[PDB]
Design a protein around this nucleic acid. Sequence first.
DNA 1: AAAAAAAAA
Length: 903
Amino acid sequence: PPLDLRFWAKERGLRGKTYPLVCHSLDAAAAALVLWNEYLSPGLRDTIASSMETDEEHAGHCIAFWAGLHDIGKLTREFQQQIAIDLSAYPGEELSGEQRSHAAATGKWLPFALPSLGYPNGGLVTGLVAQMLGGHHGTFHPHPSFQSRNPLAEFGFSSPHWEKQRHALLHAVFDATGRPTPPDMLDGPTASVVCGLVILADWLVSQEDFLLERLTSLPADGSASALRAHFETSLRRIPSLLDAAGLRPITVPPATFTESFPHLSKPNGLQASLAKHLPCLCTGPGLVLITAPMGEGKTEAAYHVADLLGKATGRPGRFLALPTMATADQMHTRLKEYARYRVEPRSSTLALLHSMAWLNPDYAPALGHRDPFAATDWLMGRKRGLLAPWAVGTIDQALMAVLRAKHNALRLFGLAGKVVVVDEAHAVDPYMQVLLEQLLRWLGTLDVPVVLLSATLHHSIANSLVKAYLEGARGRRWNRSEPQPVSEVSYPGWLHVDARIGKVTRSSDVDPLPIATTPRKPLEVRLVDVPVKEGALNRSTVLAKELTPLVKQGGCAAIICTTVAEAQGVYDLLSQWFATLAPDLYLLHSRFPNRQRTEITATIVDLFGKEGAQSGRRPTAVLVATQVVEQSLDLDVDLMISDLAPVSLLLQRAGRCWRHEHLGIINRPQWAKQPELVVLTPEQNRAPWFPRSWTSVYPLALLQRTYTLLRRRNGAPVQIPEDVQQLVDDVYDDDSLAEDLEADMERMGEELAQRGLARNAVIPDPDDAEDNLNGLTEFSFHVLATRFGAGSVRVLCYYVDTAGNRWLDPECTVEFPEQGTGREGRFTMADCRDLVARTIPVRMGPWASQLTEDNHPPEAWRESFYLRDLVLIPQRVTDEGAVLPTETGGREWLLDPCKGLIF
DNA sequence: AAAAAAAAA
Ligand SMILES: Nc1ncnc2c1ncn2[C@@H]1O[C@H](COP(=O)(O)OP(=O)(O)NP(=O)(O)O)[C@@H](O)[C@H]1O
Ligand SMILES: [Fe+3]
Ligand SMILES: [Fe+3]
């Protein structure tokens, strides 16, 4: 039967007309073909064609054929009658009441139609091809189950008249795509990636502009020659679509380490070792783990290793995952610089990928006229970022690929053609570490090479990550009998893993010498007791005792406190003590409005960092901060005083001590004899005690084992970096360090709880997804999280006078905008930037279950993604001008300008 | 009680 064009696929926004189903199908088949040839990394075409075990050209046409079948489930009465249509020639298949989505219909029909073209009835390949297409709206379905000998009828396809039109369609795209014979094999992981491809295909050719265009040259009839014409036309008009969305490859020339970084006169020890021993190792899919200290050129090292592995695997794309949004911003700058120099592309975006990327003026858009590597409007969309040829963003963006959520197969497809580089792997907690492990496991099976950068890494984590990657590569998991692939890490050191054979190659094995790093003075670590008042720390004396030389002779110091309260206490006291005259005083923590925090930080690195010392602005000064100091802040301090924290974190903090001493530029005061970290700890009165406020942030046992490990050294300095990795390993490894068996077990139990939540959250192991994709998107009883915990909400403080009316400043000069200064009273981007710039992150708690109507944003705000979820915090200001502490959620708040938000 | 991330076709 020749095919009827009366059956549509699109109607919306089409100004009264309808695009035919066949035309969408051919379009979507065309896009997939082009995507295969012009978007896919060559390595990825290879990986896929191997799973099907056929040549690439065939694999392509198969894929294109499949793509053209994605919306066939639309050829039902349930879908068709959503608008006016003349179905009089089509009696039967009366409405069932099921209300069954069209993609669900595809996956229900395809298993019993495919065999008429060659597919093995009840085959694994047929099963997967139906399931995968059935999942082209981001949700896979179960394999169809039936009890009769007539599944088609059993599933609602009872009318000969309807069944004819669906086979017409089936043959129309089969023919139009060159009638590809069925592949022999197809596995789950490969199928899920292809699902991604099919989804990108649908999306590209569903753009209103592209549609209105094809709508000017519909086919006259349903003849083979006409549909052949339609397909070939859409074939031509798709590469244009790629460029308009900036999906074109960024390819980078092979290059030695120096040719890639010509501005570098004296390549690092780490860089020399990597560049020398790695090209011979990088013969295909592998994982590299570099673990080295801060300030050793890890970034350039990474790009190079990434460039090798990219070439070895025909994968030109890149994802760099960073721990924070800010570091992602910075790295996005470096990589883009690297791009410009390294390539000899106005249709390829270097995407920036995190939740605040839209409100970045320098990144977001306000064709062919474009800046190179610039964001396109298309990639700025939801779910599309990883489809950018190159991208840097938060690690959370990659981790979202292995969560059981809609459209994850899209993100999986995005990564599958790239080299993924995750930086600061030491920063990933036990919940994130299970997600990382599932990603590595899935990346391993998909042939994607990985570079893991870290600072020191506990050997067990190191072991888990490479074990995870090897599992994916090798098809099978780890035995109980099987030996561990990584039993030791060296800091500094690197490590190569071959995916094909599973050979681990330590840097030790290829060179007996240790990797030369910046030499530096060992770190003096000094445990000092503090009197406890009211289960708190009376740091008063000591602060005076230890800071005394700095008031006379000058210098730079930092005090690090476990909580924001304790951080605010210390500042206040420093101020009281300082009213008695030079030196300066600063306070940094997370509870400041953005604009303020981005300002405080800038001046603080301005004084204590490298471009400060170089420019002479470095003072003759004290900083008080919380764990924000553990983030990348360019600081060099002459003395550091810290509350006890876990050693990994202490040692992390202590890397701010004399950070740039090898620069030779800085003059240290006569009292700063050696680089020193002072570690405060409560005096006791037989397993160590710590403040409740401390034990709520860090598990008690960890603080105990850390104190015990440090006491044991009797004053002895920490040689750097020879002593570090052993400390890091030992705090967890040495059981004699924990004398509170009860506190220690709890610690272990809390860790279990976090890995457990994680396992609920993630998609199956690749081998569990072999013949069944349904578990990738299965969930019941909300949104799954990339990080553990109750999280944070963004608050905004508004001001109320006696009158009383709503203001944005204590001075009551800036009216609280009920509306937005855009046409229609709507908010703009640049509007949302001004509001968000004064928002404060606040940690979720009981206070949120006690909010009221005046804690919620006005009606106009709900229309805005960025403002809808804000919490409003009132602040009462007296008619004298003083700001009062104000109750919200069952407690009192006050946004002090020097001390940040207080509650 | 830290810090950190987080509308499709
Ligand atoms: N020989 C060199 N090798 C690598 N980087 C160098 C070299 N000489 C100067 N640099 C620069 O040193 C700067 C900072 O060094 P770097 O090792 O990156 O420390 P960092 O940025 O504080 N920590 P990280 O970014 O994680 O590596 C970068 O801008 C480099 O370009
Ligand atoms: Fe669809
Ligand atoms: Fe579609």
